[PDB]
Amino acid sequence: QLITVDEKLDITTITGVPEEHIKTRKARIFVPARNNMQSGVNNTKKWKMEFDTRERWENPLMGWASTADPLSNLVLTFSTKEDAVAFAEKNGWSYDVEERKVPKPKSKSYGANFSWNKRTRVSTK
Amino acid sequence: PTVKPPTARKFIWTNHKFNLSGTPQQYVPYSTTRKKIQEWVPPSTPYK
Amino acid sequence: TSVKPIFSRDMNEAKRRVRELYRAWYREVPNTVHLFQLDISVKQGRDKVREMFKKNAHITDPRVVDLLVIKGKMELEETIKVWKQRTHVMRFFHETEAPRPKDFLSKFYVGHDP
Amino acid sequence: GVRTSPTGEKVTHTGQVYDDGDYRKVRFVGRQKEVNENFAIDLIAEQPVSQVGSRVISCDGGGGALGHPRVYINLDKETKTGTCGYCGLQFRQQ
Amino acid sequence: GLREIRIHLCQRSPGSQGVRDFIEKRYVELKKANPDLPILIRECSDVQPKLWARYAFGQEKNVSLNNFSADQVTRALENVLS
Amino acid sequence: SNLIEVFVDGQSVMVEPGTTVLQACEKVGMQIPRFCYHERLSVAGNCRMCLVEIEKAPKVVAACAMPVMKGWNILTNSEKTKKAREGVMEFLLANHPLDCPICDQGGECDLQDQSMMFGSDRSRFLEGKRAVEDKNIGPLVKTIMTRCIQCTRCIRFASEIAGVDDLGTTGRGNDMQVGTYIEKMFMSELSGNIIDICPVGALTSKPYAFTARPWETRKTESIDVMDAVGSNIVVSTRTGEVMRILPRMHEDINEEWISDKTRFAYDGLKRQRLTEPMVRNEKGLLTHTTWEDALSRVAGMLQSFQGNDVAAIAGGLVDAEALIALKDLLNRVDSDTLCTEEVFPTAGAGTDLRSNYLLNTTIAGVEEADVVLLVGTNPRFEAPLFNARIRKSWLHNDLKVALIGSPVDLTYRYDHLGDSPKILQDIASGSHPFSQVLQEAKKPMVILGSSALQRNDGAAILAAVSNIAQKIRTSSGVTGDWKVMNILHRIASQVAALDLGYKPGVEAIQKNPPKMLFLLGADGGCITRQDLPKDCFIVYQGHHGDVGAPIADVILPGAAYTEKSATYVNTEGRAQQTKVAVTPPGLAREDWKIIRALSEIAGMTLPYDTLDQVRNRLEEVSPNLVRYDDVEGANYFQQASELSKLVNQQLLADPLVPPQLTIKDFYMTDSISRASQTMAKCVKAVTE
Amino acid sequence: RPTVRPRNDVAHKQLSAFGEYVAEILPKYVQQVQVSCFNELEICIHPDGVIPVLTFLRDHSNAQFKSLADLTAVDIPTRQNRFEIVYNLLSLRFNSRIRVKTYTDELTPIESSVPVYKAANWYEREIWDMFGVFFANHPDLRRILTDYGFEGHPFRKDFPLSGYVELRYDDEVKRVVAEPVELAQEFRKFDLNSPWEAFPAYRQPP
Amino acid sequence: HQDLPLGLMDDIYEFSKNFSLRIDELEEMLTNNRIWRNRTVDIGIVTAEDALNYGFSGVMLRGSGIQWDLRKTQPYDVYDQVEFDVPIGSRGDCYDRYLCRVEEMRQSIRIISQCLNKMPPGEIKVDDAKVSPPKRAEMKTSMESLIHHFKLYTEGYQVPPGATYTAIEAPKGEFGVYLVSDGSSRPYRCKIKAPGFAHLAGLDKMSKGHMLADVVAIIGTQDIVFGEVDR
Amino acid sequence: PSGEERCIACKLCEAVCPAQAITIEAEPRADGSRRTTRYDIDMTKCIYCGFCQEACPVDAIVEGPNFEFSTETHEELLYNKEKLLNNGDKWEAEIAANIQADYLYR
Numbered sequence A: 001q002l003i004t005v006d007e008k009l010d011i012t013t014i015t016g017v018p019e020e021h022i023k024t025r026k027a028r029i030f031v032p033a034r035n036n037m038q039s040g041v042n043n044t045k046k047w048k049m050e051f052d053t054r055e056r057w058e059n060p061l062m063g064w065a066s067t068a069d070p071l072s073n074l075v076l077t078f079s080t081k082e083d084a085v086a087f088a089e090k091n092g093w094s095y096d097v098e099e100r101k102v103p104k105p106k107s108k109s110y111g112a113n114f115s116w117n118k119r120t121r122v123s124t125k
Numbered sequence B: 001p002t003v004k005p006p007t008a009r010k011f012i013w014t015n016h017k018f019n020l021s022g023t024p025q026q027y028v029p030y031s032t033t034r035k036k037i038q039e040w041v042p043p044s045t046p047y048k
Numbered sequence C: 001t002s003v004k005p006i007f008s009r010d011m012n013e014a015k016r017r018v019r020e021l022y023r024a025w026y027r028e029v030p031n032t033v034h035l036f037q038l039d040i041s042v043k044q045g046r047d048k049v050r051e052m053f054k055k056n057a058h059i060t061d062p063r064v065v066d067l068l069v070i071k072g073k074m075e076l077e078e079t080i081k082v083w084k085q086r087t088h089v090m091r092f093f094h095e096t097e098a099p100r101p102k103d104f105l106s107k108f109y110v111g112h113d114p
Numbered sequence D: 001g002v003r004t005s006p007t008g009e010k011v012t013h014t015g016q017v018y019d020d021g022d023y024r025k026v027r028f029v030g031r032q033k034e035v036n037e038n039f040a041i042d043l044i045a046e047q048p049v050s051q052v053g054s055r056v057i058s059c060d061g062g063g064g065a066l067g068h069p070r071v072y073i074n075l076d077k078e079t080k081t082g083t084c085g086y087c088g089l090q091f092r093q094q
Numbered sequence E: 001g002l003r004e005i006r007i008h009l010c011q012r013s014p015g016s017q018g019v020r021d022f023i024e025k026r027y028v029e030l031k032k033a034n035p036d037l038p039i040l041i042r043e044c045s046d047v048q049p050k051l052w053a054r055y056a057f058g059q060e061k062n063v064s065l066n067n068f069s070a071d072q073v074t075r076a077l078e079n080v081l082s
Numbered sequence F: 001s002n003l004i005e006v007f008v009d010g011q012s013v014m015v016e017p018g019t020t021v022l023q024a025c026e027k028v029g030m031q032i033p034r035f036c037y038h039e040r041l042s043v044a045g046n047c048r049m050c051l052v053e054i055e056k057a058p059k060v061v062a063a064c065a066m067p068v069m070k071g072w073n074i075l076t077n078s079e080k081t082k083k084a085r086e087g088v089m090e091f092l093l094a095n096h097p098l099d100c101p102i103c104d105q106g107g108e109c110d111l112q113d114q115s116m117m118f119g120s121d122r123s124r125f126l127e128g129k130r131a132v133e134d135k136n137i138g139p140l141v142k143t144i145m146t147r148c149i150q151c152t153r154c155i156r157f158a159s160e161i162a163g164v165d166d167l168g169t170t171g172r173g174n175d176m177q178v179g180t181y182i183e184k185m186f187m188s189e190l191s192g193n194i195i196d197i198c199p200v201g202a203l204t205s206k207p208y209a210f211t212a213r214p215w216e217t218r219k220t221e222s223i224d225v226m227d228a229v230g231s232n233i234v235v236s237t238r239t240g241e242v243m244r245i246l247p248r249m250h251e252d253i254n255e256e257w258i259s260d261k262t263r264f265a266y267d268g269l270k271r272q273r274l275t276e277p278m279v280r281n282e283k284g285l286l287t288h289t290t291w292e293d294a295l296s297r298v299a300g301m302l303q304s305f306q307g308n309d310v311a312a313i314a315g316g317l318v319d320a321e322a323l324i325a326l327k328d329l330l331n332r333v334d335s336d337t338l339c340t341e342e343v344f345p346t347a348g349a350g351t352d353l354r355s356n357y358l359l360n361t362t363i364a365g366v367e368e369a370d371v372v373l374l375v376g377t378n379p380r381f382e383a384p385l386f387n388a389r390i391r392k393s394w395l396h397n398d399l400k401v402a403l404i405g406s407p408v409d410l411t412y413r414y415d416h417l418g419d420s421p422k423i424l425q426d427i428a429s430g431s432h433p434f435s436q437v438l439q440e441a442k443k444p445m446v447i448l449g450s451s452a453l454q455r456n457d458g459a460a461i462l463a464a465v466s467n468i469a470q471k472i473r474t475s476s477g478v479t480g481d482w483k484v485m486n487i488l489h490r491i492a493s494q495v496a497a498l499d500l501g502y503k504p505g506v507e508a509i510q511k512n513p514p515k516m517l518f519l520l521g522a523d524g525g526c527i528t529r530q531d532l533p534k535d536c537f538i539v540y541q542g543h544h545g546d547v548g549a550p551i552a553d554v555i556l557p558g559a560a561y562t563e564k565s566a567t568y569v570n571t572e573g574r575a576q577q578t579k580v581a582v583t584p585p586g587l588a589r590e591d592w593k594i595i596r597a598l599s600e601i602a603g604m605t606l607p608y609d610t611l612d613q614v615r616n617r618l619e620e621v622s623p624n625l626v627r628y629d630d631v632e633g634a635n636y637f638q639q640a641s642e643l644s645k646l647v648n649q650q651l652l653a654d655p656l657v658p659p660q661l662t663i664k665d666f667y668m669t670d671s672i673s674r675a676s677q678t679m680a681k682c683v684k685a686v687t688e
Numbered sequence G: 001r002p003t004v005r006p007r008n009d010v011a012h013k014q015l016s017a018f019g020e021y022v023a024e025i026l027p028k029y030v031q032q033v034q035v036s037c038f039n040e041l042e043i044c045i046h047p048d049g050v051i052p053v054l055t056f057l058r059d060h061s062n063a064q065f066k067s068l069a070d071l072t073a074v075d076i077p078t079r080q081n082r083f084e085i086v087y088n089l090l091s092l093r094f095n096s097r098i099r100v101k102t103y104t105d106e107l108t109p110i111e112s113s114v115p116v117y118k119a120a121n122w123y124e125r126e127i128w129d130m131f132g133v134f135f136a137n138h139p140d141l142r143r144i145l146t147d148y149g150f151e152g153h154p155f156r157k158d159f160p161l162s163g164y165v166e167l168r169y170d171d172e173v174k175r176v177v178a179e180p181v182e183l184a185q186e187f188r189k190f191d192l193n194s195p196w197e198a199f200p201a202y203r204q205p206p
Numbered sequence H: 001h002q003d004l005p006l007g008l009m010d011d012i013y014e015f016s017k018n019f020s021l022r023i024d025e026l027e028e029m030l031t032n033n034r035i036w037r038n039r040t041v042d043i044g045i046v047t048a049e050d051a052l053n054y055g056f057s058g059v060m061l062r063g064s065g066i067q068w069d070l071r072k073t074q075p076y077d078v079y080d081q082v083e084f085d086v087p088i089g090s091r092g093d094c095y096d097r098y099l100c101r102v103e104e105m106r107q108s109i110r111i112i113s114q115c116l117n118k119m120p121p122g123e124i125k126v127d128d129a130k131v132s133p134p135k136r137a138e139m140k141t142s143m144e145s146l147i148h149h150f151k152l153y154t155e156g157y158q159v160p161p162g163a164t165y166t167a168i169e170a171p172k173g174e175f176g177v178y179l180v181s182d183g184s185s186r187p188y189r190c191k192i193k194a195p196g197f198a199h200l201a202g203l204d205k206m207s208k209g210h211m212l213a214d215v216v217a218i219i220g221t222q223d224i225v226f227g228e229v230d231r
Numbered sequence I: 001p002s003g004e005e006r007c008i009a010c011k012l013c014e015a016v017c018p019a020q021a022i023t024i025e026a027e028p029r030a031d032g033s034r035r036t037t038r039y040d041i042d043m044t045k046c047i048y049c050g051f052c053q054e055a056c057p058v059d060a061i062v063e064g065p066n067f068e069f070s071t072e073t074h075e076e077l078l079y080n081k082e083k084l085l086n087n088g089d090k091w092e093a094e095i096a097a098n099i100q101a102d103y104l105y106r
């Protein structure tokens, strides 16, 4: 037999996360931009959730990059924007969603390279 | 090495050193890179 | 909004378990202070129990409350059976942590964190 | 090519040296600063330029498979030598 | 003393039609009357229209203008200016 | 209706006619391998990596160039397709140098990655390799041309996007070489983009060389503040250090390009930094102190002065959150002298109506216009990515472009109407022949540069240009919803300052000199101590020691744009926000937090304690400032035009000369780029 | 073909036939049955079916999966029920292995399978400890791997690799203390995924 | 990773030649010793039925008479090509499990003998450079080899999406991995099945009705290493 | 053999290191060479697996034959580039012969 629960789902008190890393963090929900150095698009398929960047300082002994932020490396993957937003909401994280950027469909024509009267005519091949 | 001597290179230590830990010749680590961020030096005159 | 319950079918049933667990923790504190030879008083121990209970006072989901009681009982069993050591009990009090700034100015002086 | 700063601390081949008011040089008090004395930049500059006949030469660093990946160097420019991008050996077309 | 007036409204919502009508007809006259009073008009989609008045030492009040008429807007400004 | 049906591996797809095979595959989510093809360049069809089999066709077709026919079944994974890819990859790698460990492309290389995915795993090439000499093309782009695969992307980009026909191929066959032939420098404001489009490590960033590998960098998606375009960027960091700046695709702003100042000036963030609060000592010299001491000193003055005795000037790189915080603080001493260095005429409506100071047509709207009139501006250097959008329309839409002002070079041929501002009156009257061009235009565009408004007769010019836009609308040539009047800004912070109610220009300060002056990143030298009373108390808050800091009494080290989450509004009114990539150096602090901390110490505590709360405040003052990535759109041009006809200002006789005439003026324009050693090398290169 | 793993169609056919067999007998619980290209049979079931399905597979004469090889969980945050419970069973009689999978979320308990396999006792304690999945009617459910008083469930995808606290000995209080974690060298996150698709056969529809 | 160095197989033969004598010396000390038998015989008895339900494997099953060995029933690599016998217990106690382990050592020598004689020639890693890195000489000469070496040591090979439970007859019992691939070069999930985990969970069952000193014997007969138990 | 460093700061060793024990920074050397300015190995993070020397394309980083380098302090086991270059100059005679003995198996 089932019960009825109309509460908004919230699990902040049973995740073990310190309050500082629930209430002062800002989660960012986005589809990563394509690395402009490459033409492949396979890394722009899934939604991601990262947290606000925090201080890094130089270790006095070695000069290594030290941190006190336990979420500095936390990156989560989601199939849809709704899945990511739902996950942030039940975990109590304040979040920002940025709409997916889709390359606009283009009109390509190899023949335009040799136009009789238009500026699209190329001067070299 | 009396029959198969090692190849000679000009940079190989001519004098072997044993473990120097706990002596004044012990290794001490440090960062080998230079300063990253250069600070602004205020003018040395009271033109203000 | 139809879900499988854990233990309690509503908040009233859940709150009964919360009170039963508080009773058990309340009575355990004097034994814990003696068994672990803690330097804290019984009043400090019982105040700590109240603070931990109070921080979850805002929950309205009976399933979440069940889990909190399930975990609270597990914590009590660790303490009573002396599976914990002195360090584990004293971790509730953060004695070696320096107080962290609360107001805007204090935080502003010490770093970039909000 | 080691050199000592005005405070007497040697400069490494990467140019590192604690400046005057840097407390971190306290770590060397009673001990020493490990500095390699065989500066590679100076050692590779002592190698003579190799005179070759062809426009294109290949270098693998010597020793066959014990060297570096084999690359080919264009020697058309007469204002400069062709330098191996792995080992720094220089070549010139004669 | 009054220091600044801000009017917020939506470009398309019916609730801002009265504010839109006011700016169409009355705003130029208003600006001529009060040449040195900054009247910041700021349109944003899907906002309920509002009138903000800023007084000396950063004291501010806001009045809703949702579903107002052009005259009700005119009276709301008349109240603020005086 | 017009769509035709094709199949990709038996899956039906409806495409418009003219769609290439490569584009049809994209519709089902299959990316055909490519090297020479770039969706923003003209089709080349020379690398052959995109060869694909069409069912029942003996010959594989170049998917990038071949238009798809009705009923075709594209076999993207057949044995014939796979063998074509392996063969082409085999040929690409035959002469390619074994450079991966020393080559900066390694780890983000399309040749490496498509070799792994679509090529064989071994070599059967038993000959010697080709080797070509390198070419010097400037201080920004290093060329290792033995790595070049002759894809001609750089050639096509330089000719089409940048409008510079300096790159080509010399020789023939296996000896064909990409370059300039003669010794020449490719120094264009968009030149650094050839690093991104070169699929290999043949073209690489000289400043970046050898410093990092792609897999170890952290990517912060952020916004550029070097101009008012608001180009979307990615900031690459490693271990708390900024390593480079990359473009981030945004179709409606910068596409996938950035200017060279945006790309290479980031090294200015490592020099001349303000890291500690400073105050004057007994000798009149700046000396380091604590935040407590410096803020207490400033607070004591803020509590002693009131009204017109306190003023602020906002610089060009300031953020909206700091702008509202400083306005709120000064309002709490009943001061309304909140100024900006950049001037915008206050005659008529002034900043009452957003449409009076926005690029109302939008950057993407240039692609729809049929005529563009540029008045007193050099958009090539003021807004490089906006000028590239004009050339894109000039190229593909046959856009007609006319200019009034100095006959600068815009990378496209334009009609020079002269440089006298009196031409604007001739056009408005109807005597000038160009007026007929505007009248016959269905979607005309008039762009007045913010640089031209820095003249004394700026209000006269704005009225004249706005008068031309009035006549065009009165005639029915225009479509109504289409907007004609545009202001092109060059300062990142200007539009946000105008939205919040700042007074544009320092005229009010010159009219009423203050006893206490706040320089919020103000480094334009607009107000010196010669324009101020003898004992003026100057507080400089910023991130660079440049022009403002040396003359200040107190220095409050602020954060740079890579070191804060801050709001900037671009020339079209779109609000965008940066993200923190690295924390501010030393004791520096977030700018809005400094003002909030100052307000509390002075007993005038501001009512917001977090970034979100100060952004809630921004909404109260201008709701558009929190609608990130949206272009709201402003109206009431008629009302603004009706008010600009009241006071009749006279047009000066000086010809319209933009501040930047040649490339040498482009590289250094703000504190960050002035502190950049790369920008100094570019300036040296284009002058010697 | 020396470098390619050979197929075994006979076992693929046998496992497929037995997969239908199980689905026909337990339609109340079975949601999906699949056989991997390397011949592994998975029965995806509704969580109510854990005890009936496991009991059937243990005791049925054509099944006899007497040995519980492994019981574990997988966290997939993008799923409404983020936790996938995986039972790996072995049948010595028929020299075969089967996998049974169900799901749950943070607040929905799963029936303990200790009555079917005594082996499940500790496996379920570990799943509770590492993922926070509660098993109903478990004889002795409590942490097993983590330290006493440990907060959180470390194997959840959203739990940080280095956690939130770390230990040291403090001379002033003369005991080991727990403090917020600070690292002399932050763990360096690497972005390794190539931007080019590797396996067309698994491409998802756009 | 690498081929055997020249001369190694000869040395493995010399070692194997003498090892059974070492086992015999061990059996001389323990097998017939009445003190050893008093410490192990009828200690920690587990029935065949219980051993299966409690998740036991390896010698913990064969000591109770269950005829099961993954090298025989689910062979991997070339175990189907070597001859050996599986020792089976009869009493299910510590002494029988000890005898099973001693006899398994003898069978391991028997298998090693066949391996030394049947070792074939050829390459020692799969000749697919998208999975296994090329030879160093190739990497330093061929463009394709250098790329694949670069990518295998930075990104690593991508694994097709899927999940597998793979087990072997490890010396302590069935050792398996439930490995989940999400298509990338890093595993999504890797659950490790340690045979000692289920064996130790059965310590309470096996120790019932025994004395304190027997608990030490029962822990030993399970052969517990806490690296695999705790992971 | 000329004395030039073999390492050209490709960072393959740093990428493959299973323990993240290697830290590298690099820039163009004054003569234009691609060389490291930082090369650290935390010998208390290292698992002595040899993946770095497998990954290295130019035989620059190796694991030598020395195993008797225990120290009295933790800090002495955080090797920087100078220490590692000194190790190379100290042990090259043995290292080179060992590589000569095994390189045909690699």
Ligand code: SF4
Binding pocket: F096, F097, F098, F099, F100, F101, F103, F104, F105, F106, F107, F109, F110, F111, F112, F147, F199, F200, F201, F202, H147
């Ligand atoms: S361009 Fe790519 S394949 Fe060529 S050397 Fe550079 S990383 Fe290697």
Ligand code: SF4
Binding pocket: F147, F148, F149, F150, F151, F152, F153, F154, F155, F178, F197, F198, F199, F200, F202, F203
């Ligand atoms: S330099 Fe680069 S972009 Fe230009 S043709 Fe060669 S490979 Fe293509």
Ligand code: SF4
Binding pocket: I013, I016, I017, I018, I019, I020, I021, I022, I041, I045, I046, I047, I048, I049, I050, I051, I052, I053, I063
């Ligand atoms: S041997 Fe040490 S430094 Fe080298 S890869 Fe292995 S763990 Fe890293």
Ligand code: SF4
Binding pocket: F101, I006, I007, I008, I009, I010, I011, I012, I013, I014, I024, I052, I055, I056, I057, I058, I059, I060, I061
């Ligand atoms: S030691 Fe070898 S693998 Fe590591 S960075 Fe240097 S050259 Fe590359």
Ligand code: FES
Binding pocket: F033, F034, F035, F036, F037, F044, F045, F046, F047, F048, F049, F050, F051, F062, F063, F064, F065
């Ligand atoms: S991408 Fe089609 S031939 Fe180059």
Ligand SMILES: [K+]
Binding pocket: F105, F194, F195, F196, F197, F198, F199, F200, F201, F202, F203, F204
């Ligand atoms: K490139």
Ligand SMILES: [Zn+2]
Binding pocket: D059, D060, D061, D062, D068, D084, D085, D086, D087, D088, D089
């Ligand atoms: Zn060389």
